[PDB]
Amino acid sequence: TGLSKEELLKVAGSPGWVRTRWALLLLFWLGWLGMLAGAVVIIVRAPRCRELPAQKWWHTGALYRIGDLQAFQGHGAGNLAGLKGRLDYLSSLKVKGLVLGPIHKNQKDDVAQTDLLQIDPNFGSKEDFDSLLQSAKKKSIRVILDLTPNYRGENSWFSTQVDTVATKVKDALEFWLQAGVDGFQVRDIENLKDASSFLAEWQNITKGFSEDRLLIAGTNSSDLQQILSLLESNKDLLLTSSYLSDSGSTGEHTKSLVTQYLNATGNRWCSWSLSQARLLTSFLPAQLLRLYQLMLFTLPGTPVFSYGDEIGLDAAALPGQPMEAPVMLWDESSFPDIPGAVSANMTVKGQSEDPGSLLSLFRRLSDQRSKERSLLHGDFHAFSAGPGLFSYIRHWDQNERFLVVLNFGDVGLSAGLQASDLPASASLPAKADLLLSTQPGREEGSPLELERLKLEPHEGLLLRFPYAA
């Protein structure tokens, strides 16, 4: 029988089972409690995932510079509506923001007439720019204004007194605050009366306005130590510099150039640009250009380019426009200065069609950074590699690992990867999921065996790994 009769059990009903059961009960919840304790101590003993270290605007995404409205728009009209249309383009690029060119009343070498505040109507009215700024915000676009008081003239800082405009900068911080600009690009420092103090000053003023409002410390100097002293006065700005153009066309040199940047930078906010504000497409050709695009973007920092850079706008090589006053030939349609001598590969349209174009390379690259929290923030460990091979182990500031392998120049190199130079925290898996590569025929998405990796002419390799630390 599968059950005993109650009254039988009441014959019967001895402590041998009654008290025994009570003892078993004590043991039952005792064991339960032991389990409970286990559940507690296992989480006490458990480590915690790195608490995701991150900055906003600094060490993230990317920004592009605007000078002339016509230039920028591939115009023509050079209006604010065109710009507003190009803001959607910007969002297709997945760029964090842009640098509004010197819209304010810049002069022909006249410090007194210069209005860092009041807008030059030959870009438009404040209200036009306000709606612009509003639409930029609606499109998730951050705007920075390049305050070069003598943009209209020869020497952007007049080659004379700058205290007059220094005051006007402060005043402009407010004028343009009212317009809606969260930051101001600053150029050539060599012509300024201790800009490092001015930048500490103004940045703190802008800090008062918002943490946040970011000035851009660009320079035509290559003196890293001067640059450092600028950083000693002011860590807080975004830097662009001819120091980074010192890369020339040499791979291992550039690798160390990067290292040097980072050494001087230390743990400060990072940013990247080979020039103060020059088309890098005009600086160097596709072969290395596309590699620098990727490279810089994949260095610890906020990569900042100029508009036209993503389209391969080598204005120096384009009749109808000088490097110094380029025209962003983004359309078919945008070629009046060079009518029919430029293909759709300059335009964003043929570049959209071309997956390896700077446009699409960049877009894919930025698409990935918008997700890759480690690209946004992590330790791009200096992974040594053969001649012309840039390489970094990206240590996500939590738990995911990436590898940069960049075959500089058109050379059929082998892996050339010194895995042995890595610390445990870098350790690295061999299954290099290829995120991006600059010679598009390479198996993007494939877990490329690093120890059997063959490198190709102009071949960047952004790779994805689990966090073998």
Binding site: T1, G2, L3, S4, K5, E6, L8, L9, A12, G13, S14, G16, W17, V18, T20, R21, L24, W29, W32, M35, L36, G38, A39, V40, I42, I43, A46, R48, C49, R50, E51, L52, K371, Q398, N399
Partner: protein, 454 residues
């Protein structure tokens, strides 16, 4: 009492995978609007199932047969094919998933930087289950009050996600996240677990349909309660999704965690208070529900005469079916040990599709031959047919999706049958077996302090 019936099924059954199924349909699709519509479809299928359950209830009201009615149409042997297998399969798998989801929720506020590893998620979950069986063993009415406490907090657990979602809706975050979209797929892709998963979140109603048949109201109006309640559920699903796409981003929903916590992290002030233990309490209510479902069914099997009455029964001290609860313990423990929530779901996926498939198959057959199902509502066989068709196709595809756990689940289902033969139709039970079974159960009852199923 039809609206009462509605509250008895929507205030009870719901969100078993509410923090599982987001990623459970996102990572299993790619749209993502169509994956929300999955939740809508899941509701639609539960409409059909419920309507069919109502028809069955009116077809054969006889025994109470929440599925015994289909046995009355298919015979006795299918009982284990159906019920026993649900006890093997669905009850503790859902218990496990829910309690593991509980554990997941619990870890994360103390680990709020990344999804934590196998830790208390399983250990605490087991502890919690055992605690709940103790709470259930404590004179049931108390566990009922405890469940009432769960249930009220549960129907706050939904609101602590949804209402903030509405705030974000008001802000216009829907437009900010308007880039989520829908389309069409000529090749007809997707993945069945996703298609399960909304049903997973809201399943059990299925049998509460018979409860609503039993509840003081016209049986002709319980379809109306069914028709009312299903869209309420899909609305809740949408509202839930709103919260998930207006508070949370599509990407945040891909962070593989108890998105309740992630959701909370997106809220202002002390968001641990904004998204509190109501999630846990919700789980516990449903966990006790499944524990009681199992213990109740163990009682039923004894009443069927398939199972030894010792595995119910009191336990005079509390007057509760502790032996039944004791069985359900290990039953859920091993499912907890399995851990993997979606494989646990795979096992549930078959079980539901196939079992509910039997329900509608019976009604389809009967309407074609031996009709007079006493439809409480004027609906065609396309309700049970279309339901059946989705569900079996999902069976096939899910088999292909994971033939290991899918194969195993199916085998478990098959091995309801020979088990039935052991419980009924067995060649010969030894006399000495009976003798020692009585002796042993005697001793067990002497331990327990008892009144047998009378």
């Amino acid at each position: 009492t039809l609206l009462d019936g509605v509250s008895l099924i929507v205030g009870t059954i719901i969100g078993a995978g509410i923090f599982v199924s987001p990623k459970g349909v996102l990572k299993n699709t790619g749209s993502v609007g169509l994956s929300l519509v999955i939740w809508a479809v899941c509701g639609v299928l539960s409409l059909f199932g419920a309507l069919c359950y109502a028809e069955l209830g009116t077809t054969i009201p006889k025994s109470g047969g929440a599925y015994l009615y289909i046995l009355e149409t298919f015979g006795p042997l299918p009982a284990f094919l159906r019920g026993w297998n649900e006890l093997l399969i669905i009850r503790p798998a859902s218990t496990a998933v829910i309690s593991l989801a509980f554990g997941n929720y619990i870890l994360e506020p103390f680990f709020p930087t990344c999804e934590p590893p196998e830790l208390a998620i399983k250990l605490l979950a087991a502890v919690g289950i055992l605690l709940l069986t103790v709470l259930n063993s404590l004179s049931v009415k108390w566990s009922a009050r405890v469940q009432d406490f769960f249930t009220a907090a549960k129907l706050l657990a939904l609101l602590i996600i949804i209402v903030p979602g509405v705030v974000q809706l008001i802000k216009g975050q829907t437009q900010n996240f308007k880039d989520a979209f829908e389309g069409s797929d000529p090749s007809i892709g997707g993945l069945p677990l996703a298609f399960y998963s909304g049903l997973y979140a809201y399943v059990g109603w299925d049998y509460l349909n018979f409860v609503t048949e039993e509840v003081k109201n016209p049986e002709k109006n319980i379809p109306l309660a069914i028709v009312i309640s299903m869209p309420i559920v899909t609305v809740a699903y949408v509202l839930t999704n709103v919260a998930y796409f207006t508070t949370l981003s599509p990407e945040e929903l891909l962070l593989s965690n108890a998105v309740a916590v992630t959701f909370g992290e997106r809220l202002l002030g002390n968001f641990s208070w904004a998204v509190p233990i109501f999630v846990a309490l919700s789980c516990f209510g449903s966990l006790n529900g499944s524990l009681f479902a199992m213990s109740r069914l163990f009682y039923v099997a004894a009443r069927e005469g398939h199972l030894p009455k010792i595995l119910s029964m009191i336990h005079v001290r509390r007057h509760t079916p502790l032996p039944a609860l004791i069985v359900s313990g290990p039953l859920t423990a091993i499912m907890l040990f399995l851990g993997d929530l979606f494989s646990l779901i795979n096992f549930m996926s078959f079980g539901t599709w196939l079992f509910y498939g039997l329900v509608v198959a019976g009604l389809i057959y009967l309407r074609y031959k031996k009709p007079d199902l006493h439809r409480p509502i004027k609906v065609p066989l396309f309700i049970p047919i279309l339901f059946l068709l989705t569900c079996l196709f999902l069976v096939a595809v899910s088999l292909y999706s994971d033939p290991v756990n899918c194969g195993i689940g199916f085998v478990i289902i098959l091995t309801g049958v020979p088990v039935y033969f052991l419980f009924v139709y067995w060649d010969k039970k030894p006399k000495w077996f009976r003798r020692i079974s009585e002796k042993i159960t005697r001793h067990l009852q002497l331990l327990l302090e008892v009144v047998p199923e009378e």
